[PDB]
Design a protein around this ligand. Structure first.
Ligand SMILES: [Mg+2]
Lengths: 401, 402
């Protein structure tokens, strides 16, 4: 029989080329081997528009209920997209929405192949970015103060005690931004990072600009230091690993020189930008896994890249594309593995191990999409289009099973 | 004999190892050749402490008066530094104070040598970072809301009208930050970058996260777009160069694959971090120049790196150090060159071009500090300690009969 699942995955569909490839993955790589159970939520742009973005919230609720989600790449619509699709508004990033609702830390890890050298000469070991998923400027308040004025932040507690601080007082057109985070969210971030480091036996590096931000960034620094001292110090020393804190400018300068091999903990914004820099440098944003690990027990595996508009238009014209589906594949395998772990269904986990291994073997053997063929050494034997590539992996799986 | 100056440079001294090397540069590389005129401001941590940080303000005022400053590396003190030096308080970043007082854009360019390949394989051409010098979180207001509450930004105008926006309402301990910028400062930032791109004949790339920050970052995007359309589109076309706007995560991915050769315009924070990433990748933080170009006509050249506490402590024990003084040197040559341009004293500019060239040629001939010798190819001929390095450049200057 096919591999059986005890609990369904929550499945969040997406946009454009990634939407096109998603059912081909299911058809060729999963359904022939697994009696795949999912709760399906279409987060394509048109369905988010139809439902006034309720579908996004509903999907996040389902992840909370079942425990594990898999997410396809989506469009966060700018005004071009609004015009292209005739949208009601510039709907908020669905990633930002899910992360807000679930909380946690997003772990981003390169999917490494031996035949692609990183951009950064020194890198010999993967660098994992642990990005705080919650708060900061992903939930902002902003004012365009067209006549200027006294610009303040204000906090009013339960009890009515008001605290005010002045940003600046200006007599000219100005812009203002406010952000927050929570002590609890930061603590869970620190914990997730330290636990990841211990599990994987890698050092943890964290950095902020605590010299400039003497209460906000300072609070991250203190919380990591205290959690580390009180909960992890001994565990780390027994495991032969270290926690290193520095300033953000110093850590980035080090990253250009390091051999790699650590967990790089980042505040939300830093992690968003830096995970993309690391992904690119190792080879591709499609060669990078992404998992949100919530302290509340939820997991969301996603393809953390664009939807490939140019390739989608080509596809609709009957042209084959060089789209790299690896991140999409690893979102499914990561999610099915976790679901299998939680459910105590190890045949599912073993399948996921196999498909991941097959994907790497295929690329390392010189059979790959065009983006990878551009940067590998030695030269690829054969460039496979996105659909041929998926078809090839399906043939390898059939030969296993 | 010695080259004459018309107008003094404003000289801002600093801390630790950089403070140690600063007179050696003057003594062996400047004073023998130039009747150096400076107005001296000691921004060492102890003078800042003694004057309650007034000396920083006074120095910024002297830059406004004379037009050009040269700044040594300084400590921005955390509580560890407070303890170390017995300070009254964690004095605010003097760089932030100076930038706030002058406004402008900080241009950060690698100091490239033929025998050092960049960390990023694709880079074949310099990348300049143009960092907006004003506002954002460098002038923050922050609250530790130990009881939570309604967290807001509030704008109270000249005429009454209160505008409030809610960040979040929480029932748990939380932290709150507010920042600002001005439309005028942003515009001056866009113009400085467009002018720099024209003058250097290089493309301009700018990026934010306007998809998430739909008024704040968006206002940067808009101001750039409008200034470019109104004031630079035709000039760019004429010069064969482009302005490219994208999202910040996209630009960083591109930076790992580009050949280089553009001006990368950055918001204040992005510029702080990304100028150091570019500097490190090209070779060292010490191999990066830094000039604040104010819209009000002032210039501040600095050594934009650390003060090297560990080396300082070794130096006090009479031990040799591997501190790289090139950025200190280039701060001086850059400031003196500008001083000479403004004063119409071209012999000073000539000397500055010569000292930069001599420094480059020293390193390219295999004589360099430890940091460079770790990454150069072929192997260094002789690794010089910081002071041996300055002394070598001195020897060369004298050999060339400057
Ligand atoms: Mg810096």
């Amino acid at each position: 029989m096919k591999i059986q699942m005890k609990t369904p995955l929550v499945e969040l569909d997406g946009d454009e080329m990634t939407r096109v490839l998603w059912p081909l993955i299911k058809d060729k790589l999963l359904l022939p081997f697994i009696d795949l159970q999912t709760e399906y939520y279409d987060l394509g742009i048109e369905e988010r528009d139809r439902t006034n973005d309720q579908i996004t919230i509903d999907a996040a609720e389902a992840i909370k209920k079942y425990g594990v989600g898999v997410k396809n790449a989506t469009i966060t619509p700018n005004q071009d997209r609004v015009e292209e699709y005739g949208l009601k508004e510039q709907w908020k990033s669905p990633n930002a929405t899910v992360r807000a609702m679930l909380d946690g830390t997003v772990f981003r890890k390169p999917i490494m192949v031996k035949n692609i050298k990183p951009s950064v000469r020194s890198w010999q070991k993967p660098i994992v970015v642990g990005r705080h998923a919650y708060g900061d400027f992903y939930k902002n308040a902003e004012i365009f103060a067209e006549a200027g004025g006294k610009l303040e932040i204000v906090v009013t507690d339960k009890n009515g005690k008001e605290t005010r601080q002045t940003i600046m007082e200006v007599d000219e057109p100005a812009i203002v931004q406010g952000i927050h985070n929570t002590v609890a969210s930061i603590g869970h971030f620190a914990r997730a990072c330290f636990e990841y480091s211990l599990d994987q036996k890698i050092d943890c590096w964290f950095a902020t600009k605590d010299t400039i931000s003497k209460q906000y960034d300072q609070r991250f620094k203190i919380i990591f230091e205290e959690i580390f001292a009180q909960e992890y110090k001994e565990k780390f020393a027994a495991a032969g690993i270290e926690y290193f804190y520095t300033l953000i400018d110093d850590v980035v300068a080090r990253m250009m020189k390091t051999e790699g091999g650590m967990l790089w903990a980042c505040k939300n914004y830093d992690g968003d930008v830096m995970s993309d820099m690391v992904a690119s440098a190792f080879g591709s944003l499609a060669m990078m896994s992404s998992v949100l690990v919530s302290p509340y027990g939820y997991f969301e595996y996603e393809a953390a890249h664009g939807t490939v508009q140019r390739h989608y238009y080509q596809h609709l014209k009957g042209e084959r594309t060089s789209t790299n589906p690896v991140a999409l594949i690893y979102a499914w395998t990561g999610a099915l593995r976790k679901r299998g772990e939680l459910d105590g269904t190890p045949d599912l986990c073993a399948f996921c191990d196999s498909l991941e291994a097959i994907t790497i073997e295929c690329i390392e053997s010189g059979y790959m999409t065009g983006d990878l063929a551009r940067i590998c050494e030695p030269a690829a034997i054969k460039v496979l289009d996105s659909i041929e590539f998926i078809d090839e992996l399906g043939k390898r799986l059939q030969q296993l099973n």
